[PDB]
Each structure stands twice: as C-alpha cells, then as structure tokens.
Amino acid sequence: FGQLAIIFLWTSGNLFHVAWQGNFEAWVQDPFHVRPIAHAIWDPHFGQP
C-alpha cells in the first residue's frame, strides 16, 4: 500500500515535467518525427557546446 503509492509520485511527475515546457502545444499542432520533450536537463558540468 506503500505500493500503488510510489507508482503515482512517478506518474504525477511524468505528467508534470510536461506542460510548462516540452511540447504539446507544438506536438499536437502536428507532430512529425522530430524530438518531442520530457524534461529539462540541468547540469553545472555542461559546456556551452
């Protein structure tokens, strides 16, 4: 019951690292095999590249 429980904190965020960012309102507009997004990477190690 500590199960089901952790499956929804997964699912919630699955739907919540979507819809401030990473399209729908471009992917529905009509979605051609380019690269629709889950989430935003943020690592300090990154270069500009």
Partner: protein
Amino acid sequence: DLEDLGNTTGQWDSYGSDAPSPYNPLQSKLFETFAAPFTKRGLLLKFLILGGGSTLAYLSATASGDILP
C-alpha cells in the same frame, strides 16, 4: 685499559625522555571562547548544517546574470 672514553659519555645517559621540550606556543586562550559556536555547542550541529549548507548551496547557485554553463 686507559683509552675507553671512560663511560663515554653518557648522556644521562641515553635518557632523553624526562624533559626534551618545553611544550607549547604561549597562545593561552587567545581563542578561548573566542569563537563559541563549536565552543558552545551542547546541543548543536544541525542548525549549522542547514545554515552553512544553505548558503553554500543557495548562492552557490542562483544568478545574477547567468555566466552560464
């Protein structure tokens, strides 16, 4: 049997231990409290852990202008 550096010589003798150095730089209690927060503690150390680590991390990142990755 003259030569031998007749008990040569000894030391007192080959002891060492009993006073080899005056111990320590004066500083007596030039600190004593002086800074307490580890000199106070009972009880602390969380308190500090959220503080130090909250700045380090908080300003450690955010802003001013990017300078980005």
